[PDB]
């Protein structure tokens, strides 16, 4: 639908992603995706990190959040690394992070943190070549409160791939977030978006 020569602000990646949802919409798939994401967010909000891994995350997962350097709209010569990886985790790396969260000597976890996630704008479409692969897009507002008066709110769009695995359960096999704020004003990005 989008012609990126006329819609000059639109990236090729973005134009490709949109195409995959405007075509045949499947109301029930949208509903399945809504349920998957709501249950994932519930598990994360109550800090059931082991359960999240066991029930929502696939063994072949790529969990990636990037921070893209600010470059000129008209930049065309400078070609060096465009972004850095805030997260770029395989399942084992996610497990390490989960173990870090659950360790009793993680002093930053006492008193207990409070998380609240808000998931919106869910879209879902099956992949054209892998019929077992489901593309899910959603936006998330994540609120984190700790130590009386620290409050950080995160905002992002998530491009996910989910696939049925062990026991027929649909699990996350890829999550990609291009984090919108270049300089984080939230102390850190130590949250699972």
């Amino acid at each position: 639908m989008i012609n990126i020569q006329e819609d000059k602000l639109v990236s090729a990646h973005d134009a490709e992603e949109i195409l995959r949802f405007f075509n045949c919409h499947d109301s029930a798939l949208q509903q399945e995706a809504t349920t998957l994401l709501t249950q994932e967010a519930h598990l994360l909000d109550i800090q059931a990190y082991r359960a999240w891994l066991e029930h929502c995350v696939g063994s072949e997962v790529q969990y990636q959040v990037i921070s893209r350097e600010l470059r000129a709209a008209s930049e065309r010569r400078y070609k060096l690394n465009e972004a850095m990886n805030v997260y770029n985790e395989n399942f084992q790396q996610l497990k390490v992070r989960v173990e870090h969260q659950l360790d009793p000597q993680n002093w930053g976890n006492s008193p207990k943190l409070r998380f609240t996630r808000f998931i919106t704008n869910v879209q879902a479409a099956m992949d054209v070549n892998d019929k077992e692969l489901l593309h899910i897009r959603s936006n998330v507002i994540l609120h984190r409160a700790r130590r009386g008066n620290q409050v950080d709110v995160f905002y992002a769009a998530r491009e996910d791939k989910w696939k049925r695995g062990e026991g027929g359960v649909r699990k996350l096999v890829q999550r990609f977030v291009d984090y919108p704020e270049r300089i984080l004003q939230t102390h850190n990005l130590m949250v699972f978006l």
């Binding site: 690394n81 850095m84 805030v86 992070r97 173990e99 993680n106 930053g108 850190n188 990005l189």
Partner: protein
């Protein structure tokens, strides 16, 4: 407050007044006496290799444009238009032959010169002396093996001399390894801490690693994992500490080439570093060749820190007394295979980046220590840095600088803060030199 007379840092740098982490008037005074006077990290050759390449960087609270000239040198200029003061460049990196101001259209070259003014002939005639309207230029720009530093003060010592005794320690990795490259772009995160908190932590704080990072050590299975929860004493001779005249200092942890990297990278690194060390033995000697594959936690005064081997490179950019913007880059050896470079960079961010699980352990420590500095009953209290005092040496036959022959101590805090008092109480470099004429004696006193 009279900074000529106020003792902010006691003799031998044994203690500092807690207010130094919270006082805004002192922060303003540091802009002048620390940040406008000393050497500050800008960038690396690897980030601006070709003519016209540029990045923006902070120098204290000021923003500068750092640009590769046609002749191969690098010049840096205030990122501020000479007409009405608008910020000239709004991106972080790019390639260009000049910069045009979006307010009234003045165009400056990569060399800082005012090159064009819209309708100059019709409006200004010949009245505009463009030669006098070039961007305000950073007086000094020098390189340390590819790492580019700037200094607003023409009277500063050369960067190599400024690095003092710390240079000897850095050279194996920075020079004899074949060279480093910085992998950008950096992570950027604001923390609610004074810039000195992480600076002091990186310059000489091995004591905190076992306790502060207990969870990360245990979870990541890195080479230092035995320290988790202060479970294990580190061996006698596991390292040392050093400091220098101009404030730079570092911890040395022998052989820890894989550093904070989780077990997935430990074998490859340890193999890579050991092979290089073997060839270096013949070129620079056993001791220095081993320094090359030993983990150095260093601060280059005032606000640039790094963990060699681990590959972490930080700039603690000052915003105000309880606000700092943390920039995090990865440093890699140029002759490492590309795939390993890529993975090391991810590991650096994984551990010490915006979502660095190690870096998160330190957040509360730095933020609360800084914020406590504003609290009434704490302002005049003394932060202690006396661990190892009276066992440090000067002029050792093998390890240069003021040196503590132990892995864990506060030698480097003392040298950092002795340099900090001397600057804050001095008006220029000559006075700093006069205040620093007996620096190593002040530091080793009771030994």
């Amino acid at each position: 407050m009279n900074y000529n007379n106020k003792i902010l840092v006691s003799e031998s740098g044994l203690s500092q007044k807690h207010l130094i982490h919270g006082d805004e008037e002192l922060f303003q005074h540091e802009l002048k006496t620390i940040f406008a006077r000393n050497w500050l990290f800008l960038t690396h050759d690897s980030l601006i290799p070709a003519p016209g390449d540029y990045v923006t960087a902070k120098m204290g609270i000021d923003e500068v444009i750092v640009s590769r000239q046609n002749d191969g040198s690098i010049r840096a200029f205030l990122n501020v238009c000479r007409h009405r003061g608008k910020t000239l460049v709004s991106v972080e990196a790019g390639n260009a032959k000049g910069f045009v101001c979006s307010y009234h259209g003045w165009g400056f070259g990569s060399n800082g010169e005012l090159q064009s003014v819209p309708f100059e002939k019709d409006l200004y005639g010949e009245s505009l002396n463009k030669k006098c309207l070039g961007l305000k230029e950073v007086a000094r720009v020098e390189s340390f093996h590819g790492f580019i530093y700037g200094c607003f003060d023409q009277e500063a010592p050369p960067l190599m001399d400024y690095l003092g005794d710390a240079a000897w320690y850095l050279e194996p990795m920075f020079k004899h390894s074949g060279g480093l490259e910085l992998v950008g772009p950096p992570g950027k995160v604001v923390i609610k801490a004074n810039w000195k908190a992480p600076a002091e932590n990186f310059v000489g704080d091995a004591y905190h690693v076992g306790w502060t990072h207990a969870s990360s050590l245990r979870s990541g299975e890195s080479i230092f994992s035995s320290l988790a929860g202060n479970a294990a004493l580190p061996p006698e001779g596991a390292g040392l500490q050093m400091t220098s005249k101009y404030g730079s200092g570092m911890g040395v942890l022998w052989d820890g080439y894989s550093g904070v990297h989780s077990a997935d990278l430990v074998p490859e690194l340890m193999a890579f570093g050991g092979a290089k060390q073997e060839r270096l033995n013949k070129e620079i000697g056993d001791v220095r060749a081993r320094i090359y594959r030993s983990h150095l936690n260093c601060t280059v005064f005032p606000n640039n820190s790094m963990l060699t081997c681990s590959g972490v490179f930080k700039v603690w950019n000052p915003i105000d007394a309880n606000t700092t913007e943390v920039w995090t880059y990865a440093i890699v050896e140029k002759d490492m295979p590309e795939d390993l470079k890529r993975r090391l960079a991810d590991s650096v961010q994984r551990t010490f980046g915006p979502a660095g699980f190690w870096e998160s352990d330190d957040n509360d420590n730095m933020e609360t220590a800084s914020q406590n500095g504003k609290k009434y009953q704490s302002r005049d209290s003394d932060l202690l840095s006396n661990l190892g005092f009276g066992e440090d040496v000067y002029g050792d036959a093998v390890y240069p600088g003021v040196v503590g022959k132990s892995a864990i101590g506060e030698t480097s805090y003392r040298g950092f803060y002795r340099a900090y008092q001397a600057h804050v109480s001095s008006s220029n470099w000559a006075e700093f030199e006069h205040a620093s004429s007996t620096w190593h004696t002040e530091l080793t006193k009771t030994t």
